[PDB]
């Protein structure tokens, strides 16, 4: 009835199943509105776009002069000759955190 003794260091040595085991189709209720997925990555998101997609240096300066969150696009394309010249994205985590409040703090309208 009773397990014998194991010393507590050996207890620290000591310390998956199918969710859809019986799966049936379920009709979705019309009130629940699913979240809209993110757009697919466009041509201009690439680190080496065609040179017709270059803006010149004036609106790069004009981009940095005006305040953030006043932009139609949070990005403009850049040119990089090699992947080692490409740095990490500066505001990636802030964008994903803004997606979090887009996912659970900003409402959906059907």
């Amino acid at each position: 009835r009773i397990l014998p003794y194991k010393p507590p260091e050996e207890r620290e040595r000591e310390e998956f199943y199918d969710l859809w085991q019986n799966e049936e189709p379920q009709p979705p209720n019309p009130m629940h509105i699913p979240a809209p997925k993110l757009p697919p990555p466009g041509y201009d998101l690439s680190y080496n776009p065609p040179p017709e997609y270059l803006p010149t240096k004036e609106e790069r300066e004009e981009w940095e002069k005006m305040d953030p969150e006043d932009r139609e696009k949070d990005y403009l394309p850049t040119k990089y000759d090699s992947l080692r010249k490409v740095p990490a994205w500066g505001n990636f985590v802030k964008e994903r955190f803004e997606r979090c409040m887009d996912l659970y703090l900003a409402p959906r309208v059907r």
Partner: protein
């Protein structure tokens, strides 16, 4: 003839404010917010906010009656009261000075810092939220994007190094599922990072893997809210990864060596046992990544397309082909610098991504080193 009030009848019965929902649930505001992430509760918009509440503002958020009633009957709400009393019991033995009673009560707590497995069990909530495996793959889009982003980020109080070590272990396990089934189709290079598209059961999954560098995290970010997102997605990851391995017949969880993982094998330590156009691309080819090229995004791609023999530098990893560059077995070396053996083709990692996207063997003469690269295109 009966008199009925406009305040008590109408949209006020249907929609309820956030403050009224919190007071009804008798929970704290972070507790109510966390339960909304797990259960998928959503504020939505009423048709007329004035009809819902006469004293109301557009900045205020409302809620539906039915999903609030689900939160009232949530077993997690019962589990929150049990965990709160248990957290009071942890400070009991600390206050008494009872070290042994503190050791066992934290062991009864099963706190996630020392375990890595999430604190609460949400198998029933995930089952209620996702009715089909296709919807799990649809939410795997943001799940894998969350997983690889927060696997690159360092450890904090909300996300300890144990949970990232579990995250990078399970992310490679899902990657090992992809390289067995050859599921990856499109790879995309971008300033934000590297995008990947793979097809599973007729469903496409997109995720973004930033470059392995130092990403600044400072500002106003809540580590608790990204922590509960990871905890929800980690539980969704484990049951999906168990389903996919049992679907293909490979055993789950796969075995691994801690010595190889500590020595830097990464993708090489994870050995997968079968029993408890993509393949034709580099069907019989040898690859050698140099020290500059990113090993982790490259190794994911060519193993997904079934290339057999790949090596890299000793300082880049462990458990690979021979490190020395004098071996003539290698055909294509991936170099990116600003030997020169005639038997070895010298080519750039940009050629790798273009050849995966086009699947037409783009010429290495055009992608020769020391020359300006052609503009690559987005497959989407």
């Amino acid at each position: 003839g009966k008199a009925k009030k406009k305040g008590k009848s109408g949209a006020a019965r249907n929609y309820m404010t956030r403050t009224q929902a919190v007071k009804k649930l008798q929970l704290s505001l972070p507790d109510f917010r966390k339960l909304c992430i797990w259960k998928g509760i959503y504020p939505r918009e009423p048709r007329d906010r004035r009809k819902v509440n006469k004293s109301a503002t557009a900045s205020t958020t409302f809620y539906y009656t039915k999903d609030i009633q689900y939160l009232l009957h949530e077993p997690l709400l019962q589990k929150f009261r049990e965990q709160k009393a248990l957290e009071k019991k942890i400070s009991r033995a600390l206050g008494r000075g009872d070290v042994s009673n503190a050791a066992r009560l934290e062991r009864n707590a099963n706190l996630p810092e020392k375990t890595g497995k999430p604190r609460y069990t949400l198998n029933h909530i995930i089952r209620e939220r996702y009715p089909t495996f296709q919807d799990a793959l649809r939410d795997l889009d943001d799940c894998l994007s969350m997983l690889f982003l927060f696997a690159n980020l360092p450890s904090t109080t909300a996300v300890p190094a144990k949970m990232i070590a579990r995250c990078e272990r399970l992310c490679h396990e899902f990657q090992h599922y992809l390289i067995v089934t050859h599921s990856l189709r499109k790879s995309f290079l971008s300033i934000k990072g590297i995008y990947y598209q793979a097809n599973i059961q007729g469903e496409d999954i997109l995720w973004l893997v930033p470059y392995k560098f130092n990403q600044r995290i400072v500002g106003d970010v809540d580590f608790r809210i990204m922590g509960t997102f990871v905890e929800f997605y980690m539980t969704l990851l484990g049951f999906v990864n168990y389903r996919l391995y049992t679907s293909i017949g490979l055993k789950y969880p796969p075995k691994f060596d801690q010595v190889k993982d500590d020595q830097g094998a990464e993708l090489a330590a994870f050995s997968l046992e079968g029993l408890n156009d993509p393949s034709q691309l580099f069907a019989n080819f040898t690859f050698f990544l140099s020290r500059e090229t990113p090993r982790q995004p490259l190794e994911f791609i060519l193993r997904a397309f079934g290339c057999k023999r790949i090596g890299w530098d000793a300082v880049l990893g462990e458990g690979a082909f021979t490190t020395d560059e004098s071996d003539p077995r290698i055909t294509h070396q991936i170099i990116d610098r600003p030997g020169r053996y005639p038997g070895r083709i010298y080519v750039q990692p940009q050629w790798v991504w273009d050849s995966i996207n086009d699947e037409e063997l783009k010429p290495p003469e055009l992608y020769a080193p020391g020359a300006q690269l052609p503009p690559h295109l987005s497959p989407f």
